[PDB]
Design a protein around this ligand. Structure first.
Ligand SMILES: CNCc1nnc2ccccn12
Lengths: 156, 39
């Protein structure tokens, strides 16, 4: 199947028609997505099969074909871009200045952009095009709006 | 059964649409990977 670097839609034919359940990043031959998108299930790319390699429900991340490769981090100051891949719609870059999720274990960047749930797994990029995390695990605030963490894995 | 389809290259785009605010929120992360607001 296709192993070229880039952003990919994650689809299923289990429900009515073809439904986009999420998005992911192919980098260095490894596909990266959020755990809640696939629930750790195997994926197909044309005739090829991608098997899960590493996953963690608490981080809400999973990698296929190899270990997690994304290790760039938000600098805590600059604007970033969400490369949103919405269901049935073209990939589109949206620039924003992240907020912060403050936790008992440290601070994490957060993007206040609201997209359909099937956009989860879309990468967040720094000014050099490096993936600093994936969009799609977050919270609903007072006003009903959605705020996602910039969720990044660890490259061993 | 789940399958993947390419949707694009990963690149920064100059003069992309600029939107969204920057909220500072107190949050908690549970064992199930769910974030919640702390007040
Ligand atoms: C797929 N479940 C996570 C989730 N629940 N609401 C939203 C909204 C946007 C992105 C992700 N979201």
């Amino acid at each position: 199947g296709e192993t070229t670097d880039g952003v990919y839609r994650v689809m299923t034919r289990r429900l009515l028609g073809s439904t986009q359940v999420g998005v992911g990043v192919m980098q260095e031959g490894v596909f990266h997505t959020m755990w809640h998108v696939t629930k750790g299930a195997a994926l197909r790319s044309g005739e090829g099969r991608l098997d899960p390699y590493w996953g963690d429900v608490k981080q809400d991340l999973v990698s296929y074909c190899g270990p997690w490769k994304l290790d760039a981090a938000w600098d805590g100051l600059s604007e970033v871009q969400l490369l949103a891949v919405p269901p049935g719609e073209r990939a589109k870059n949206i620039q924003t200045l992240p907020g912060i999720f403050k936790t008992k274990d440290g601070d994490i960047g957060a993007v206040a952009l609201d997209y359909p749930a099937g956009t989860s797994g879309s990468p967040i990029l720094d000014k050099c095009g490096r993936v600093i995390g994936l969009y799609g695990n977050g919270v609903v605030i007072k006003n009903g709006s959605y705020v996602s963490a910039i969720t990044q894995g660890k490259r061993e | 059964d789940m399958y993947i389809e390419r949707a694009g290259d990963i690149t920064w785009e100059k003069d992309a649409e600029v939107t969204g605010n920057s909220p500072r929120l107190d949050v908690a992360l549970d064992e199930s990977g769910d974030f919640s607001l702390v007040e």
